[PDB]
């Protein structure tokens, strides 16, 4: 029913280079400030899904150097991705997170022994998240999972704020989506009501993880080409949350009684993860990548002149601290100064592409129509993607066949 | 012989050690304490026939529109500057000009307060048409965090109200949202 | 996502930490406090046509001869049983 793409497509001996030049993202690492609903400084963090929608030149109307090979009848031209390059330029740095109002009341390890200060309140606490190093390339945007509060419970329950059902919501991973965490990839804006169980960056958003199961389980494999993953975490401190337990522990396991007791502690225990050491040797970027054979039936074919590259990197997530003076004084005064958190994130996207052709037969037309008809009216023989927000890059009028003028071209001519 | 470099600062706005627990209190006029600190471990060699450059963050042009302000966030801009002898390597605090943008002269060790650390830009060693600035480069850099603390002083960009619930006694004066 | 879980006990026999210093010797009435932890890092796959048998140390048969006891040490036995779902990792 479904056949590999290389059975019908044809690879030519034509290679072009594209470069995104300098890409910069500067903004506050925790929340997007806006004065009179005008976001001057948006959300910019090293803990952010970077989804780049690359638009491509039409190979059919492009100034092809050898138009003799091309035939307007029964032959169309598409771009095929060959090599990729993600140019990080910022130095190494671990991001810092936290929240001033969090439920950090007992230190179970008893080195600190916080002892749950009196009355229901909060306290300031901060930590770092895990080392996450992920990159994805594809002709379709990635799909990732997260659990959340979906449909209500079975039958007709009567309750007031009990445990909701858990549903595996699978959503397209767009720019503005929050990375996985050691606290679980939930919809904390809705599922969590305190807005105080996690640091400020993830309390009002929806963390989600790429569900590789459905990702690879696609019949056509349009949603992936190849994935690179490195993850590192280890729990550095153990603690509990306050509040009451709606699912109490049975008495059959715990013996209670006597003074200084008969009130059980919280059965809710979580941790603070840490990434430990970063290194340049463990880096997966600033190095050429070659697409020998994709796992799915899509050997780098960019249908519809659209490309999707998503990266998350924590090695370049260092948080910048700024200070300024309102006034000045003879002595050091706390009132004269204002403090700001600014984050930067630098990107280069460098690509080498190979020209691809196709011969139109009746079964070929039927297959290419069944898998996607939108491209079929594109070649002219309501995209839902306009609603979602991505980081768009335009690589039109930037393709160059003079690949020897670029370092990626040199590395490409090094091997074949 | 191999040896770890050490720096520090006697009067730094080390507000509160925050990791295991926090102590949110009203700050005084001065709360600076002596703090010792090491840097990220870095090995780097660059060679060529042209002097290598480096990126560093700084204050760019004046603020856009026609603004009147006293202590706002300045326009933060990348400046490409050629590396000379005497410059300091980037540490974990970011490749930027502390002498201009860090007003206290007190938020970092003294070795990097009045100076500027800048990290070399491999991207302009690559994207240059000739590559005269670089023949071949070696780097090996390792780093990991050991403590967490907040910063004293006012927060010029306060936290949004819809994300944080506050009330009752000991509050309506927010804690330090700056975390380093 | 790759993540580590936390267990613990609200009332565990955590008398005193002994790592660098120790408190007074004899306990009081009840010194049994809130403490949590995480377990060892495990990865294991077994594959076959017949289900695996695994062992644990348990109170086997009573002591030899005819001893009279009151909370004495029970004998140790390497008891073998088939691993079914619901059992939990060492």
């Amino acid at each position, epitope marked *: 029913k479904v056949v590999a793409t290389d059975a019908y497509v044809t690879r030519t001996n034509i290679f072009y280079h594209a470069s995104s030049s300098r890409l910069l993202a500067v903004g506050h690492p925790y929340f997007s400030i806006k004065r009179a609903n005008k976001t001057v400084v948006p959300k910019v963090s090293g803990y952010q899904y970077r989804v780049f929608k690359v638009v491509l030149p039409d190979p059919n109307k492009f100034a092809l150097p050898d138009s003799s090979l091309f035939d307007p009848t029964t032959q169309r031209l598409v771009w095929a991705c060959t090599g990729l390059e993600v140019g990080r330029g910022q130095p190494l740095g671990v991001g810092v997170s936290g929240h001033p109002f969090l439920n950090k009341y*007992d230190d179970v390890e*008893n080195s*600190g*022994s*916080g*002892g*749950n*200060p*009196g*009355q229901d309140n909060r306290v300031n606490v901060g930590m770092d998240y895990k080392q996450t190093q992920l990159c994805m390339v594809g002709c379709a945007p990635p799909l990732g999972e997260h659990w959340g509060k979906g449909k209500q419970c079975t039958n007709t329950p009567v309750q007031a704020g009990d445990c909701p059902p858990l549903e595996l919501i699978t959503s397209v991973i767009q720019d503005g989506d929050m990375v996985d965490t050691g606290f679980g990839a939930m919809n904390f804006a809705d599922l969590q009501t305190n807005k105080s169980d996690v640091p400020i960056d993830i309390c009002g958003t929806t963390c989600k993880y790429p569900d590789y199961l459905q990702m690879a389980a696609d019949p056509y494999g349009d949603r992936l080409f190849f994935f690179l993953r490195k993850e590192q975490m280890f729990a550095r401190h153990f603690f509990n949350r306050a509040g009451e337990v709606g699912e109490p522990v049975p008495d059959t396991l715990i013996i209670k009684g006597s*003074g*200084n*007791r008969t*009130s059980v*502690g919280s059965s809710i225990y979580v941790n603070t993860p840490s990434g430990s050491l970063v290194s340049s040797e463990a880096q997966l970027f600033n190095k050429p990548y070659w697409l020998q054979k994709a796992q799915g039936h899509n050997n780098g074919i960019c249908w519809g002149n659209q490309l999707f590259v998503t990266v998350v990197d924590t090695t370049r997530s260092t948080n910048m601290t700024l200070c300024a003076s309102v006034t000045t004084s003879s002595t050091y005064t706390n009132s004269d100064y204002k403090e700001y958190m600014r984050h930067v994130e630098e990107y280069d996207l460098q690509f080498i592409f190979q020209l691809c052709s196709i011969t139109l037969s009746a079964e070929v037309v039927a297959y290419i129509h069944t898998m996607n008809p939108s491209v079929l009216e594109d070649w002219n023989f309501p995209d839902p993607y306009k609603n979602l927000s991505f980081w768009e890059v335009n690589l039109k009028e930037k393709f160059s066949s003079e690949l020897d003028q670029y370092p990626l071209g040199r590395k490409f001519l090094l091997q074949s | 012989p191999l040896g770890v470099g050490v720096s520090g600062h006697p009067f730094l706005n080390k*507000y*509160d*050690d925050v990791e295991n627990s926090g*102590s*949110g*209190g*009203n*700050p*005084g006029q001065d*709360n600076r304490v002596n703090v010792g600190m090491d840097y990220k471990q870095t090995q780097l060699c660059m060679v060529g026939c042209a002097p290598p450059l480096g990126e560093h963050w700084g204050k760019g042009k004046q603020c856009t529109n026609t603004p009147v302000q006293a202590g706002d966030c300045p326009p933060l801009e990348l400046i490409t500057s050629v590396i000379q002898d005497g410059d300091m390597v980037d540490t974990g605090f970011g490749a930027m000009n502390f002498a201009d943008l860090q007003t206290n002269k007190s938020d970092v060790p003294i070795d990097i307060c009045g100076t500027t650390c800048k990290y070399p830009d491999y991207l302009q060693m690559a994207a240059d048409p000739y590559g005269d600035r670089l023949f071949f480069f070696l780097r090996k850099e390792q780093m990991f965090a050991r403590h967490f603390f907040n910063r004293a002083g006012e927060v010029g960009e306060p936290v949004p109200d819809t994300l944080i619930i506050k009330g*009752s*006694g*000991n509050r309506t004066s927010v804690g330090s949202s700056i975390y380093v | 996502p790759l993540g580590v879980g936390v267990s613990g006990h609200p009332f565990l026999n955590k008398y005193d930490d002994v790592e660098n210093s120790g408190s007074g010797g004899n306990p*009081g009435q009840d010194n049994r*406090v*809130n403490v949590g932890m995480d377990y060892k890092q495990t990865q294991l796959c077994m594959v076959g046509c017949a289900p695996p048998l695994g062992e644990h140390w348990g109170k086997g048969k009573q002591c030899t001869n005819t001893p009279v006891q009151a909370g004495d040490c029970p004998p140790l036995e390497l008891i073998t049983s088939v691993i079914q779902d619901g059992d939990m990792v060492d």
Partner: antibody
Amino acid sequence: QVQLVQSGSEVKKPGASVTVSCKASGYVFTGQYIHWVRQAPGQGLEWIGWITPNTGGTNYGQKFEDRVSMTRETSISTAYMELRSLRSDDTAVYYCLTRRYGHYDLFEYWGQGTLVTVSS
Amino acid sequence: DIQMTQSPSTLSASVGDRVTITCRASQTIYNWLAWYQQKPGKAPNILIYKASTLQNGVPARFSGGGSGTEFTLTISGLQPDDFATYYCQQYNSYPWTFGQGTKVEIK
């Protein structure tokens, strides 16, 4: 044993400043919350404020947030509290006291108290 | 500020009697309460906390209870050393506040 020792009783003129110190020993001094309260003859207990040696983070009551300034030092681990604009009604005994919230415990310690008398 | 009223302000009783002292809170406190007794010239110490929990080293004749704003303390059997001034303090919110006090003295 955790020992907390306050300064001796003092008599001062109105409008002046007083300084009350109390040295603590026998425990990790930095990680605890030390508190100032005062007891007037014929009236109940009331709370002045609280500081911890970490950060010197102060917090004052709504009543006495203006006339007081209080700090700590870790060399011999002593907390100082000074009062300005001595009103004649402030003649009272003053107590510094610390508390550790345990998992299931509360470790309570008080100073011996210091009498402060103000008159013309 | 959170206020409270202790009733009765003054009570007289003989040895071995059962006596109940109450206090009313201005706002809700739940169980964040403790009780103090002060002997003349000496610093008071904790006897009851958690609104129901005895402190260690203290005899079990001393009992506490209550919820919301209504809180009670009971002595089943008086002793001569127990005759002192009694207060209830919430540690709910800052500022900390104490009652007017309750003095007990032998009949």
